[PDB]
Each structure stands twice: as structure tokens, then as C-alpha cells.
């Protein structure tokens, strides 16, 4: 008859890969799923140009 | 003509001040709104005893 | 501690800083996981996209 304190996850499954990007001079990128408590996001820098 | 980079808020009003407390030696407290977005929470300690 | 029907007794702060996604001591449907980035890593590729 004990109560739980913390519950850690050791087997996690990812889903719904999505992305949104903007070019260097235009500014920082953003995606609507950043505000969702069930999504993990990351902002990184990638090569961009005429190509 | 420009894009919108970021909007700051300088006048805000709060509502639904809901709190929760557990007695000492029985761990921390929790509320379902601390994981909810558009909310702000703070966990602290308080004088507790028999009274 | 209970994991896959295997049970143990763990020290005070050793259980606090287990580097895994977690949720607090209140169980609801579709729980909110905290620090999910500890199990989902996205680091850089050659260029042009991260995996």
C-alpha cells in the first residue's frame, strides 16, 4: 500500500517525424508542434544557398 | 512590408489560482496544471504540523 | 522500485537523477513525459538535415 513518486521510461517509441525550416537571412525556424507536450523538437543550422 | 519575428506581452492577467499541498515526510506536491501549457506554477515549502 | 516485475530498494537521490523521461506521482491517461530528450536524440548529419 504505497504511492508512486516518479515513473521513468526505459522503452520509448518515436512517431510523427516533421520539420520546418527557413533560410539564413529570413530568420529562425518554427513548427506548431513545439508547443505540444507530446513532441520533442530541436533547432539546428544547416547549409543553404542557391543549390 | 515585413514578416513577424516575435510578439511580447507587456500586460497580462491571470485566473484559476489553484494550489495543492502534501504534508512533510510525504514527498512533493503535484497539480495537473503544472504540465499544462499557458499556466505558471511554483513548488515551495510551508510550516506544517498537528494544528 | 518496480520494473518489469523486478523490484528493488533504491537510495534517496540515486532515484531522483535517473537520466530517463519521467512523470510525477499522479497517474492519468496519456501522461505528460518530462525530459524526453534524454531518450530521443537528434544530432547533426553531414548537412542539409538532422536525423
Amino acid at each position, epitope marked *: 500500500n504505497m504511492a508512486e513518486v516518479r515513473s521513468y521510461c526505459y522503452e520509448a517509441s518515436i*512517431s510523427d517525424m*516533421a520539420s520546418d525550416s*527557413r533560410c539564413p537571412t529570413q530568420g529562425e525556424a518554427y513548427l*506548431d508542434k513545439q508547443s505540444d507536450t507530446q513532441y520533442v523538437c530541436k533547432r539546428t543550422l544547416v547549409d543553404r544557398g542557391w543549390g | 512590408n*515585413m*514578416a513577424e519575428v516575435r510578439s511580447y506581452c507587456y500586460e497580462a492577467s491571470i485566473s484559476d489560482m489553484a494550489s495543492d499541498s502534501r504534508c512533510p515526510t510525504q514527498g512533493e506536491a503535484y497539480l495537473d496544471k503544472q504540465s499544462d501549457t499557458q499556466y505558471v506554477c511554483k513548488r515551495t515549502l510551508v510550516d506544517r504540523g498537528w494544528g | 522500485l518496480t520494473m518489469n516485475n523486478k523490484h528493488w530498494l533504491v537510495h534517496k537521490e540515486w532515484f531522483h537523477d535517473i537520466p530517463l523521461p519521467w512523470h510525477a506521482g499522479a497517474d492519468t491517461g496519456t501522461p505528460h513525459w518530462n525530459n524526453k530528450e534524454a531518450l530521443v536524440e537528434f544530432k547533426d548529419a553531414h548537412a542539409k538535415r538532422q536525423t
Partner: antibody
Amino acid sequence: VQLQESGPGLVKPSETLSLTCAVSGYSISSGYYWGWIRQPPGKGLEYIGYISGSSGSTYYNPSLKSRVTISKDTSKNQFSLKLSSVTAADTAVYYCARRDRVGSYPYYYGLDSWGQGVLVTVS
Amino acid sequence: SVLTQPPSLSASPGASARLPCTLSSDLSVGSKNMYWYQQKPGSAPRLFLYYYSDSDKQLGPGVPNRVSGSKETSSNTAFLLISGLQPEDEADYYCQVYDGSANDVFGSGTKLTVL
């Protein structure tokens, strides 16, 4: 990079539809979300949804809440659509589309590869 | 959420043809990836132009650089500019974007008639 479409041309109301698109020129099990987009005759476009090419997550249109079901099978390199309990307003020309939606190069997010189109009439 | 386009549009060969696509009040056109599709009768709609700004743009495969884009955040409208109207540019143009839940919103469809 070609998309072949299949299904019955004429279907009666209150019956689950059956469309299936064979991907001739690309492997599905690498990414590149695969979607369905229809078009009422003479009017604009109305998308149906899409399914992920790696995980299998399906996402649809707000109006087509529970009437659509997208499946897939990489053995024959195909993906299917089922429109359960069609109505009279569902008479339209259906198109199979593909999109990147993952990674960089935002131009590839738009539907670059389309289908020939299958006319579906309800009566 | 829906995008509005005028039904008819005509211009002489040569001079520019500006094709508008007004976004709804809940959307900001200045921060949305605009997509333009070109559809000729009896054929599949081909992707024509992706436009976010004059420094973030990609035309379709084999499309001449005489097609540009522009955004007007005053009236919250996106544009599809086509200078040098040739007889092969006569088609039906649609706009398309994302939204909060990644739903592709399409436009009314501007039917471009060339003289």
C-alpha cells in the same frame, strides 16, 4: 516517381470505397509521406489525408473525420484508401499525391508528384 | 480556414499577370510557406512555385524565371506574378499552405485566360 491509381469508377452510396495506388519508381520504406487529395468536378481542391512512409502514421481532413481509412503494403509497393459510407456529395475526381514533409528544402513539402486521377461517381 | 481567389483574370501577352490568394484572418501570410499549382484541363495539377519571400523561393521543374512571387501583409494576401504571358501559361492556378494541425488549405483557384 510515377503513381498509378486503381479502383471502381462508379460506386453506390453507403458503401466503403476502394482505391489503391502503386508506386512505380520509388520505394515507400524510406520516408516521403503518401497522401490522397480529391477534387469535386468543376470546383476547387479538397485534400483527404496522408500516411507516413516509415512509421505509418495517418492524418486526415477535419470534415472527413471517421469516413476515411488509409492503408499500405510495401510488398507490392502500394497504399490504399477506403471511404466508408459514402454520400451523394462525394462525387469527385480522386488524385494520389506524394510529399516530402521531412527534413529541409521547404519546396519539397508541397505535393510534387501527383496521380492521373480516377473519376468517382455516387448513385 | 480557407483561401480566396478571383475566378477570372486576363491580360495581353507580355505584361505581368498578378494572381492573388487572400488568406483568412486566423493566418499570417508573411510567415506561411505559399504553394502554387498549375492545372491545365484534362491533366494532373503540377506544382508550380513555392514562395516564402523573394530570398526563399523555388519554381517548378523547367519553369522560366519570369515567374515570381510576392506577399502583401497589408491586405494579408499572397501573389503569383507571371511576366511574359506566353500561350502556354493559360491554366488554372491554385494556392496551398499548412495550418496548425498540418491541414493543407487550398484556394478557390484563379482561372487565367490569355488573349
